[PDB]
Amino acid sequence: KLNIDSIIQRLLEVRGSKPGKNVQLQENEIRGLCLKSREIFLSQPILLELEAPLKICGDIHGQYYDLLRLFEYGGFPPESNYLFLGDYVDRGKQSLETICLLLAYKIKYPENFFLLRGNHECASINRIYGFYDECKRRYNIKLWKTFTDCFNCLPIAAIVDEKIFCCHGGLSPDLQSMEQIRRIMRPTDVPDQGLLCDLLWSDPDKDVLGWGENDRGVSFTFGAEVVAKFLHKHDLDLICRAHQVVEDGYEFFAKRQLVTLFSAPNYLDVYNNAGAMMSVDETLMCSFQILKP
Numbered sequence: 001k002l003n004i005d006s007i008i009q010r011l012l013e014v015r016g017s018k019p020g021k022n023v024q025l026q027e028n029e030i031r032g033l034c035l036k037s038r039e040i041f042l043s044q045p046i047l048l049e050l051e052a053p054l055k056i057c058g059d060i061h062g063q064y065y066d067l068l069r070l071f072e073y074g075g076f077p078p079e080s081n082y083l084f085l086g087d088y089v090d091r092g093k094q095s096l097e098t099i100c101l102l103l104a105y106k107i108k109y110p111e112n113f114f115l116l117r118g119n120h121e122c123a124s125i126n127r128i129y130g131f132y133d134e135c136k137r138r139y140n141i142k143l144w145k146t147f148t149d150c151f152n153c154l155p156i157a158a159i160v161d162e163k164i165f166c167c168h169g170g171l172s173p174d175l176q177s178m179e180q181i182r183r184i185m186r187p188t189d190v191p192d193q194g195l196l197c198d199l200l201w202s203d204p205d206k207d208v209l210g211w212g213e214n215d216r217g218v219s220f221t222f223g224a225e226v227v228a229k230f231l232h233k234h235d236l237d238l239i240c241r242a243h244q245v246v247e248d249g250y251e252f253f254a255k256r257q258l259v260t261l262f263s264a265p266n267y268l269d270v271y272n273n274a275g276a277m278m279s280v281d282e283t284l285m286c287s288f289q290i291l292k293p
């Protein structure tokens, strides 16, 4: 009953309009996007096994027109396949248009479009950093809770061609086998510290080789040795994550065993960072497409 094509049409109708122009979908349409995508998320693994070619994107944080710029540069679905690493809402001015377009494409192209969970796809987080307020203003809190129920079902990681491990934050001192991830049950809010918490919040740190203290006030930091042990144990070549703002949109850490992607140019209007998107072809060759602010 949900008219996906009309929703997409209206959402894309603003590409070319003055940045900031809102697209106000009906409440029933947004709830449908949430309920239908949730079903698909639960129907697919929590640890996705994808194949190149694919375009991987980092944080978007409600910068809708920048999301439109990414698609125009990388190709609107289904021209290209996409994998987003999380943090779709909060901070930006248009989290609603942003998340709705993404859910809409997930429903429209369930086998060629994927979305991972970021720490901002968490109630306790998006309640404070913007999304809740945006829903309260343009719609209502009940709709916000519907979004939360959808987010609690997002997959947590993906492996591209058995070589690239993708997640939002990073590793966990609790992560020993890939099975541990695959066994995580949904829906789930992340109520306790531990594996899922770390996957959503950890960061690589240049100072320590093993495990360190995280300035975020949650989770930990991990060094090059930790990364090395992980990659070899699971026969992987690289970790692709997001979660941290980087100047060039992308940046390597842990002696190039990990790459961080961030796709929200000029973050919060304060940073003058660029946004980036990483393209991976069938020859498992990695390439970066930058998006200047």
Ligand SMILES: C=C1[C@@H](O)[C@@H]2O[C@]3(CC[C@H](/C=C/[C@@H](C)[C@@H]4CC(C)=C[C@@]5(O[C@H](C[C@@](C)(O)C(=O)O)CC[C@H]5O)O4)O3)CC[C@H]2O[C@@H]1[C@@H](O)C[C@H](C)[C@H]1O[C@@]2(CCCCO2)CC[C@H]1C
Residues within 6 Å of the ligand: 091, 124, 125, 129, 215, 216, 217, 218, 245, 267, 268, 270, 271
């Ligand atoms: C969000 C965050 C963290 O990520 C953030 O990490 C730190 C370390 C590095 C990071 C810096 C980021 C900068 C680049 C940006 C640039 C701009 C312009 C603004 C700003 O924006 C930050 C938030 C946000 C969203 O914009 C982000 O970019 O991260 C806050 C500091 C701001 O100067 O910094 O700041 C320290 C402050 C910390 O503050 C909150 C943190 O308190 C959240 C807290 C840990 C949570 O705890 C709970 C309980 C425990 C388990 C987890 O859930 C409940 C929910 C919530 C209260």
Ligand SMILES: [Mn+2]
Residues within 6 Å of the ligand: 087, 118, 119, 120, 168, 242, 243, 244
């Ligand atoms: Mn994050």
Ligand SMILES: [Mn+2]
Residues within 6 Å of the ligand: 059, 061, 087, 120, 243, 244
């Ligand atoms: Mn983020």
